Amino acid sequence: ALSKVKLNDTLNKDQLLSSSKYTIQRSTGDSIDTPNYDVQKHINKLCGMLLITEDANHKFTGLIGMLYAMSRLGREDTIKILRDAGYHVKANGVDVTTHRQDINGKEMKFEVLTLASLTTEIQINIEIESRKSYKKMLKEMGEVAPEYRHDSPDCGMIILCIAALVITKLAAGDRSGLTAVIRRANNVLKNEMKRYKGLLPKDIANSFYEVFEKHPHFIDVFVHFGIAQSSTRGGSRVEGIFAGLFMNAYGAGQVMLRWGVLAKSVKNIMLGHASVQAEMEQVVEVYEYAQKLGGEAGFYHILNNPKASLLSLTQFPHFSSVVLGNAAGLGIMGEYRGTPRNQDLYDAAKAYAEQLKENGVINYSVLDLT
Amino acid sequence: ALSKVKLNDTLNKDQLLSSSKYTIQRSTGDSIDTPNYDVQKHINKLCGMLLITEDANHKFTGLIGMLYAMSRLGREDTIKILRDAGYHVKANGVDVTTHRQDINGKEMKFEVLTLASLTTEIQINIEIESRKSYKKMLKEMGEVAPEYRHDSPDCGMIILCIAALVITKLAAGDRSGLTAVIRRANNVLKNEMKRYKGLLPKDIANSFYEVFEKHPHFIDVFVHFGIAQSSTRGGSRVEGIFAGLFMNAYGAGQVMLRWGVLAKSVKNIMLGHASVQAEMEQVVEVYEYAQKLGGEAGFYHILNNPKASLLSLTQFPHFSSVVLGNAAGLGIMGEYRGTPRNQDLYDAAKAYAEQLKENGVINYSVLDLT
RNA sequence: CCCCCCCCCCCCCCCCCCCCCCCCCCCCCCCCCCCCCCCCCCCCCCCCCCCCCCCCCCCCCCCCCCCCCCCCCCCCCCCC
């Protein structure tokens, strides 16, 4: 029969990669700091010091942010997530030791984490510069409140909030979203910026952009931290910020998949076009594949997953054009750097999409009027 | 087919968070006091001492309130709810020891709980100041009745009654409801304020506001206590008041969800508007998601649950406007700090909603008249 | 290379208390068993017999095209 001549390449390609006999393990490096729950409270203090510091140096805040995320996970878990990702990890412990150094003649004590990635010499400078800003703050308002100080439990998550904004715009993969990351960090997190002088969206976002670029394994650590953080029963409003901002990243690097359902929902006439209908057999395979993966496919582009290319609709020129045209006519895209392969289908879809959104008459058949 | 091009993001996002391989555990601190049933009666006495004290210092009453709630749960259960919430707990026992101290020269005995969070030095001062108010009360009325004294079993729940009022207005998350908490504590719980001089709604509410802010894990303990308290077969009228005041918190931080059903019930014409109907596919998903969760979604904003953002209708500008307008026209909102994204839909919905509530004619078809 | 060790607190015990006590042999009857009839077997009958190797042709496969991605967006706020 002619019904039998078929070949499910999409399912077979997945079967090949899923049943690999051998494994590659990428060079994570010489060592990774794996802090446990006992240090979490010290890192939150370190995160607070950077936040209270006016015009703070956020060169290490991307790294310090990851240390807080790993301390929340705990040494056992964060090692487990690195090994499950596919990395040989040389686990370095993290705890508190008292360092004595004579700054400006007078001998001073400092509680420092003995980290491999972060030197004890730069850790004291974060505390030194924070004490300067603290006494300046204390001189201005007399008594500093619990909100404005570094001891607040939000401090650690406040730094991870803009980390979730950075992870939201990692799909582009060229620090192009930085403008949107800062923009949202002013619309969102506005109360937090009032109570902390050193909440600099541009400076902190670039730090997280740097640490995710330099260390691709830490983006896997943050994503699985964010999912673990979002799996909790309840916390604070700042943790509610992080959870909401983190879930905005879900479905990044695959907007054409969502806009394709929109074109189907609004019933754009150019979907029924002949050349678009020729592709419909294969576009359903990727949508069914997206339905198969489920929640797993959300961070397939944020984490540069090999199977992220399978979710692409760009391989279908005609369907992509009408979907990208529908988005243009409804006026939801811009400045989206996706170009339609078929320009005629794009313009026709844009024209009909503009006609769909016109005027606004009341539909009385929807209501249960007697 | 074009019916297959779909993607249930709401269900897949839940599937991602529900199937997390790893877990985060937040720094609960150095230690938590986990009192058992044997101390419950001592804390009730301590709660009574604060209530009989005229112009009492309710600095520790928020913490003392949590200790009574945890004593009612019992060491085994309160440890279980902290671990299920996602917290590493260092359980400190709570029981009675006799402390001898010479106040004003004369050596005096005091039954004190050896708590970590509460010092033995401040515990005796609660008893000392209560004895002053007790003898002043005894001098005025001669013989103090069972209602006015600290030994009454209601004392512990009376302090937790305004804790339920604080939890009712935690959705705002900025002590803005304090005015309403004091207001309702005067309308309801009025008989209790007559029999206790130290029932200060403003002072006690601020104490619970402080302890929930400083310790986010205790708000999880109180919510699960209130549900466990509400699951009882029956009790006193004060316990009945607490159960009623606690269930008023159910559905906090999601009033737009309830007002949306009201607009559908009253049949506001602006629901059938074109731009509102475009959102109807996605607004049903969140209502069906709210129906899926059931009783679990009640305290999703009180407990700052990551999945609380999923219940938001604010993401839909047009539907939110007509729903917020319907509430304005019926005259049920105010001073609600929610602003409509679409002003024209809000005004049109408000206008029709005002026309719905006019006059009042008798409908004789409703009755079974022969 | 570096480096004594040690250091507190503390007899134990203490009360109350014999046990036992009654009633009661057992058994007793009836009753050998068996008994008859009866060897078994007997016939007929080797089996087999023919025909027949199998195989034989034709034929590498393959060859094109193609990263992906890029937008926007915390939530909440009343009353009871």
Numbering used by the authors:
A (entry chain C), B (entry chain B): 2 to 371
Sentences from the paper on this structure:
Like other Paramyxoviridae, RSV has a non-segmented negative sense RNA genome that is coated by the viral nucleoprotein N to form the nucleocapsid (NC), which serves as the template for RNA synthesis by the viral RNA-dependent RNA polymerase. The structure showed that the N-protein has a core region composed of N- and C-terminal domains (the ‘N-core’), with the RNA bound in a groove between them. In addition, an N-terminal and a C-terminal extension, called N-arm (residues 1–28) and C-arm (residues 360–375), invade the 5′ and the 3′ adjacent subunits in the RNA-bound ring, respectively. The NC is a flexible helix, with variable pitches and numbers of N-proteins per turn of the helix.
Here we set out to determine unequivocally the handedness of the helical RSV NC by electron tomography of purified NC-like ribonucleoprotein complexes (RNPs). A composite subunit was assembled including the coordinates of the N-core and seven RNA nucleotides most closely bound to it, together with the N- and C-arms of its immediate neighbours on either side. Although the close contacts of the N-core with its neighbours are scarce, there are a few key contacts between N-core atoms, in particular the interactions of the Arg234 side-chain, which links three consecutive subunits. Thus, Arg 234 from subunit N−1 makes a bidentate salt bridge with the Asp221 side-chain of N0 whilst simultaneously hydrogen bonding the side-chain of Tyr23 in the N-arm of the second neighbour along the chain (N+1) (the subunits are numbered in the 5′ to 3′ direction of the RNA along the ring). Superposing the N-core of one subunit in the ring with its counterpart in the final helical NC resulted in a root mean square deviation (r.m.s.d.) of 3.9 Å between Cα atoms in the immediate corresponding neighbour, with the largest displacement of about 8 Å. We have demonstrated that RSV has a left-handed NC, a feature that is in common with other Mononegavirales. The most important implication of this finding is that the 3′ end of the RSV genome is located at the pointed end of the NC, and not at the barbed end.
